[PDB]
A paper describes a structure:
The PduOC:heme complex crystallized in the P21 space group with 2 octamers in the asymmetric unit (PDB acquisition code 5CX71). Each monomer has a three-layer, α-β-α folding that resembles the profilin fold. The octamer structure buries a large fraction of the monomers, leaving the two antiparallel α-helices exposed (right), but hiding the other three helices from the solvent. Across one interface, the β-sheets from monomers are hydrogen bonded, so as to form a large, regular 8-stranded sheet spanning pairs of dimers. Each octamer binds four heme molecules with each heme sitting in a pocket formed by the extended β-strand and an α-helix from each of two dimers. The heme iron is hexa-coordinated with bis-histidyl (bis-His) ligation by two histidines (H18) from adjacent monomers. The symmetry is such that pairs of corresponding residues from adjacent chains form the pocket (Phe14, His18, Thr21, Arg22, Val25, Val48, and Trp50). The eight heme groups in the asymmetric unit are highly exposed, with solvent accessible areas from 251 to 302 Å2. The exchange of His18 by Ala abolishes heme binding and this shifts the equilibrium from octamers to dimers. The bis-His heme coordination in PduOC is consistent with a possible role in electron transfer.
Numbering used by the authors:
A (entry chain F), B (entry chain H), C (entry chain B), D (entry chain D), E (entry chain G), G (entry chain A), ...: 10 to 147
F (entry chain E): 9 to 147
């Protein structure tokens, strides 16, 4: 059930291809179900911050079993998990671009994209994920 | 006056059993009156973030002599301790799930639960604390 | 011009005496004009967090040539230095209890109190400062 | 295209000269297109916090290809990159004083000023940048 | 194959019992096959350092697939992995008391003991491991 | 003209993984550019957890010191010129083998780092991968 | 059983007085039995490193229940706890100047001095300890 | 008694000029008597490590009141300050290239050079120091 070589290779290829179509250089990061960095690819000229944000988005997706855009409302002032980003010492990113990857009810990894607008990062991520046979929810 | 073996054992057992009833895997953490990690137990499949949040809640409860849900208002924009989570470099958690433990007016420890919704974490924590009948306020 | 032995000893004594009158245990911290820790004194049962907050308040006062309560408005959402506490990795504290210490137009140090309410910490600090011949503004 | 000795020297001198005119001591920092510290200069009595803020402003400008005052709106509560300063563990500063430096469509570095009001920092930075043959936008 | 509740409970009980027989208080730590803290138990008056060293020994065992005493020679001056403890920022401990736990050729976790002499820690760890049906090599 | 291309990165990464498969040792492969930025990472199943940190560090060291990492082993020993270096740089530099600096036409273009086997295996894997593309390991 | 006001005061005074006699400026640090910083005093012109070394020496004494000079042999290459200083991320200091304080078989705190030679730090620490009624071994 | 503008400028220029004569690109760093970074200059293509080592050598010179080559013997296995580089969490560098700057018996700052061989760094640093009216010992 885990991510196979083919899964990893296709996710990464499809993300890079979609980023090229959008004309935005990104960092692509994939983590396994335990949060271990498994693939990283940086396109030329990607924003330097993206080297830290993409793997953090992928990690966040696994570590909270969620897509990172789904955390945006819950960390606001007044919301249930206000302060989370400081409580976890910057390890969680709470804007879009990270998705949890599921197969047959089992969490198999996380994908993180950074380098565009949040909308671009999410488009790239969703396009990549559509290239392989996986879900973004259990 | 201090947490005995029986206190630590029953707090842990009761927390895990309540979490089983709720069908949510959590990390349980107990710290002593000086904030030293005394017991940690991770249920299978608990959110990875919970491994950091539960001990931090337990620590926060002792370090601020308060339940963590009682810090939620006082760290908001405009409130007296705005910014506290950054000032203490992520050591304090300001949402529910941590309680201070008191016996005969003496602070004896802190219990932290993380892995569910905030309300679940607080339910589990309160249940565990009710199993040994210590107080949560001086 | 600098804090003398007598300055340091009287500041510390007066802060502790005032805390005793208020019946709240605090940490007292004094830093020099360069931000080096010079005196620390912890009263029994002071909040654990105060061991970190009091020196940070003192340091903040010198590092920003201000009282720490004067930073509260400027770090709010919408205000000029929003985010400051993260930018400086938790070294600055932006609620009351730290004061800059000045003599003959020269910055000689900083005093930080933590362990009570913000208002108690500011009272203690102001009382201590009144015990020696120094100002809180240039 | 890169920053020459002359570019660095003129930037630094013009910044210091403008700060002297404003009668505010600042830290001046210049990073290259990869974010490596290239020049630092501290004026006597500059706020201690400026030693950390000015290089961070310069680094931010390259790392996000933006002037730092342009990030102020996008990190607010409710905005698209809320929490960014914690996600990047304090490496990015999101109030004014940092500018990205461009020549012939190529990013050649970043300039950061800290020590005055945000407006003084920006005036100093803009004055310095006007002393050499560069743009602040691609 | 993984560590069951019974495995974890017996390891912990047996380590504590052995420590009691030796009259030395220890910290017991167990990590899973991915290095995630699963159980921590601190006996009263265990050396404060043991709170950091026991989990690090358990983690090292899984992270290097080795008992920690088997790393002592290989990190010495002149040996193949000299400097390893600094390369990994203190995450690995290279003296005895940590053991990797294997069942049917599969790595299922790590156990770490700290609080005694290295020889006591190893005794305690070996005694605990003998209480369950597992090997210390693949 | 001489930077690492897509093809360079791809071939380095593939050849490293292929060689690690031949040796039957799972590794982490890391490539950094001439400025030390992480460019590629690839982790093989069951690689030592430590190798997730050690491989990118090796690659970064190679560029940050313009050297192969095995060439630092003597110089950081007790009594040698750069004793303590690993602590001075807060663990960012690794001083045993497996990292190589990558050069073309006298220009530094990147760094490759391998971790997960013995130090010898990591070097073998790195050298094999480097041979798949025609760059040099010295200026 | 604990360090009283009189104990803390006399330790600190006696350490400063001795350091004055020797004409070496030091930092004095005292921690309680849980390792919490209780007193710090810095003499003018004390080595900057001493602001970190002295509290660490005091902490190490309690955390390891030993004098710090007693750790020097055991951390050497080839000895049982080689690497310890990196394993504990610099929290332990292994050269002289820190002493564990005992009364009636109970560990009550730790004293740390830094700023002279190791031998001066030890002379100062020992002179200070001799000013109160305590032992340096259980 | 302090480093003037001219002192800072001349030190920096002379260091860069000597590095050019040796044909090695270095990072030059100057700190004041309190260890605050005052000047940094990076020559093109200086080793990336030098960006961290040169300011650390300058800081070390002031923080230990010594040239950094004078620390080499004292931090060896078997010597009085073995482990120091870890105790201070990498803030001190114990090989040559850093010098303390003294005028009329007063410590006024530190100069640090990194990028060459240790001998080249020391040559550069000594040459720069010779360009102004200061000593390297009290
Ligand atoms: C921060 C790093 C700096 C470095 C490395 C530096 C380096 C130098 C060097 C190498 C020269 C000689 C140029 C030549 O080769 O002929 C020079 C000249 C000079 N620098 Fe600087 N400088 C620095 C900053 C400044 C600053 C901040 C000022 C004034 C605010 C200043 C004022 C001058 C003056 C007046 C000259 C003489 C010629 C001229 O007016 O342009 N320099 N500097
Ligand atoms: C540290 C030393 C520990 C000791 C000495 C210990 C001892 C025991 C004993 C004597 C029992 C009674 C049942 C029997 O006859 O086997 C027991 C039950 C139990 N303990 Fe512990 N325990 C320890 C730690 C833990 C921890 C950390 C947990 C975490 C949840 C735990 C969970 C339980 C549970 C759930 C039971 C009752 C259910 C069952 O045994 O199947 N114990 N323990
Ligand atoms: C890590 C990031 C990787 C990316 C972005 C990536 C991307 C690609 C792309 C774009 C192609 C088609 C290129 C072409 O031939 O025209 C390709 C082909 C291929 N890749 Fe990868 N790849 C990666 C890693 C790997 C690894 C680690 C392996 C093997 C261990 C691998 C094996 C292959 C093979 C066997 C082919 C087809 C053979 C051929 O090109 O004729 N790739 N990859
Ligand atoms: C660091 C925290 C210190 C605190 C909180 C403190 C507090 C006090 C207090 C409350 C007294 C009155 C004692 C009594 O008679 O009951 C006192 C007296 C004294 N202290 Fe301290 N003290 C401190 C440090 C020092 C140091 C470092 C020295 C000398 C190096 C010192 C020298 C004295 C002397 C000589 C007296 C007797 C003269 C007088 O009453 O002013 N103290 N201190
Ligand atoms: Cl915030
Ligand atoms: Cl070492
Ligand atoms: Mg049950
Ligand atoms: Na926050
Ligand atoms: Na905050
Ligand atoms: Na009971
Ligand atoms: Na913030
Ligand atoms: Na934030
Ligand atoms: Na080391
Ligand atoms: Na070292
Ligand atoms: Na070490
Ligand atoms: Na060391």
């Amino acid at each position: 059930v885990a991510l196979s070589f083919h899964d990893l290779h296709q996710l990464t290829r499809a993300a890079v291809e979609r980023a090229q179509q959008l004309q935005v250089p990104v960092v692509v990061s994939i983590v396994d179900a335990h949060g271990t960095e498994t693939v990283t690819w940086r396109m030329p000229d990607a924003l330097l911050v993206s080297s830290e944000l993409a793997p953090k988005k992928a990690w966040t997706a696994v570590a909270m079993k969620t897509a990172t855009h789904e955390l945006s409302d819950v960390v606001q002032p007044g919301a249930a998990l206000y302060g989370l980003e400081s409580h976890l010492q910057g390890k969680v990113v709470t804007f879009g671009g990270g998705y949890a990857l599921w197969r047959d009810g089992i969490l198999i990894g996380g994908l993180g994209i950074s380098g565009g607008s949040v909308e671009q990062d999410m488009d790239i991520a969703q396009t990549a994920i559509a290239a392989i046979n996986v879900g973004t929810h259990q």
